[PDB]
Ligand binder design. Structure first.
Ligand SMILES: [Zn+2]
Ligand SMILES: [Zn+2]
Ligand SMILES: [Zn+2]
Ligand SMILES: [Zn+2]
Ligand SMILES: [Zn+2]
Ligand SMILES: [Zn+2]
Ligand SMILES: [Zn+2]
Ligand SMILES: [Zn+2]
Ligand SMILES: [Zn+2]
Lengths: 234, 234, 234
């Protein structure tokens, strides 16, 4: 799969690669399109919000590889709010969101569920990262269904309840997104384990965002993103 | 122009390239001499002051490219003080200074003007970055004149009232410095827009610091910098 | 010597290279094994503790170079405690510890001495960095002896009382470790000055850890480290 949608740079000290490391690795591993999704600013060991605002300066294409500007936002509360400002939204192409302890501590199932669904229903998010995380128990079918209705993808995460999530998305009719959640560029694009989960449930290839750059970019346009001309040839 | 004097590294999370990225880009784009000028420590999302003190360890030359140790200091007050310590000064070659909100909020014209002039007159600065910034209204002619008298260059900034600044420096007789104010290495040395401003006013090429490494280094020696032997051949 | 055991990345703003810069430099300079030892979290301008915990994701080998996960911990008190947690210990291979001002201010000789000896006796440390630092006066022979008894190496530090330390380790019978204490990858593996100190005292080559990867890794196994299979061929 020549698209990877979820990775981290030194903007967090618990990651260790830069933008240039990811471009170089993509070139080496035949990746044509990727997104940098640093942790949102309310998280501990996450960058300043300006880190997201100033991504508007990034080149679109380097050595043939397209680059998407993203964030892995933190879900803050049962209202589905995330630590992403309007100014931040304007600079970004890809909005991923998910549960991280220091921002949202695992609560009762029903709380986690309502907070995830509200985030999905908000219209402000493209992808929920690692919803299969055992630390945050949720009603999977209810989430998948909400995700299908609001056209949000549920992540199947390599770094990483994922079979349940995958079969759920299969039946609800939604999108699955694949993400390495790389904290170094060495695991970029590495989905072997994700792939097994999907095979074990016979997931339809037609609903994997990562199959091609164009399929992923079509999805972002369906969600309201103005087309990115520099990406036409991908 | 084979010299670029103003750029930023990951030491701020709103920048995204390292020292090694800038060296590699310079090599690719035919740049023979550059300066890293991270934001001064009083600014938000800026490094620890040790970041400037420890630049004394940097190699002078890599792959034929010379490397200047610098800072983009923040002007703090009407007295022309900047967030650069004596220990910091001893490690550095190039001192740039300018107005940044979190440290100095735009005030009345007269305030901005006196603070800029005092910074220029202090003797502690080589270059005022983006003085043409509309956010900080100033008496241009008075600044240019002060800059000519104190032998400080006024920046014409690519990242970016610049025609007014340029014609002013033209008539006052001072130096202009060109800076990409790159926050990634991809725009290093990129002055196309600066160049247009200068052409529109018929600026004398003889007063552009960036024409050659030697011209820039002669200027730093005129301001009191002991000569840098590793740079002789540039 | 094809092993360097002490260097720093951008996780501190007073360093300027990444993991990928160090791998690239090692390849260029014929280094087969190195360790990244960022400053411990209690220090100023040091990373979040997660920076050490998440090193468990690092690849073992890149371009033929083996990579050790380490920390330069800070000695906190006369009890020999360091700013390294149990969770942090589990992710790491190499534990270096030493005196740094903001965490432990130089005290009377006897204090520095007891704090260093206690750190050595704790069993939690492999190497004391720059014990020859004049800022922290110590009873050298007592330290070396303790180091020999507890099988801890004393660093002879290039970045840098080192002749006294070296002759002391010579007579006490302990290990010496060589470290560049690089804050950029450009000085990686650079021990010329260390080497002179050792020659001046006729130090036995048999007791220099850095002679070969296997000798260094044998020492870590003697201290209780489960063997690292990916390193067999080094
Ligand atoms: Zn993370
Ligand atoms: Zn996450
Ligand atoms: Zn993530
Ligand atoms: Zn900036
Ligand atoms: Zn600026
Ligand atoms: Zn700047
Ligand atoms: Zn240091
Ligand atoms: Zn140290
Ligand atoms: Zn060190």
């Amino acid at each position: 799969y020549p698209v990877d949608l979820h990775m981290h740079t030194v903007a967090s000290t618990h990651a260790y690669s830069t933008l240039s490391d990811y471009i170089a690795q993509a070139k080496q591993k035949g990746i044509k399109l990727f997104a940098i999704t640093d942790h949102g600013p309310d998280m501990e060991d996450a960058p300043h919000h300006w880190h997201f605002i100033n991504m508007r300066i990034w080149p679109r294409v380097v050595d043939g590889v397209g680059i998407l500007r993203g964030i892995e936002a933190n879900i803050k509360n049962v209202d589905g709010e995330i630590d992403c400002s309007g100014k931040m939204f304007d600079s970004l192409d890809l909005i991923i969101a998910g549960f991280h302890e220091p921002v949202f501590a695992p609560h009762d199932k029903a709380t986690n569920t309502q907070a995830m669904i509200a985030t999905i229903a908000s219209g402000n998010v493209h992808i929920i990262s690692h919803p299969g995380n055992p630390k945050y128990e949720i009603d999977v079918k209810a989430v998948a269904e909400a995700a299908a209705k609001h056209q949000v993808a549920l992540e199947i995460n390599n770094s990483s309840n994922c079979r349940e999530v995958a079969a759920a998305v299969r039946d609800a009719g939604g999108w699955v997104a694949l993400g390495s959640d790389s904290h170094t560029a060495f695991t970029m694009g590495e989905f072997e384990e994700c792939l097994k989960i999907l095979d074990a449930v016979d997931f339809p290839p037609e609903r994997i965002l990562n199959v091609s750059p164009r399929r992923l970019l079509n999805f972002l346009e369906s969600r309201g993103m103005a087309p990115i001309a520099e990406f036409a040839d991908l």
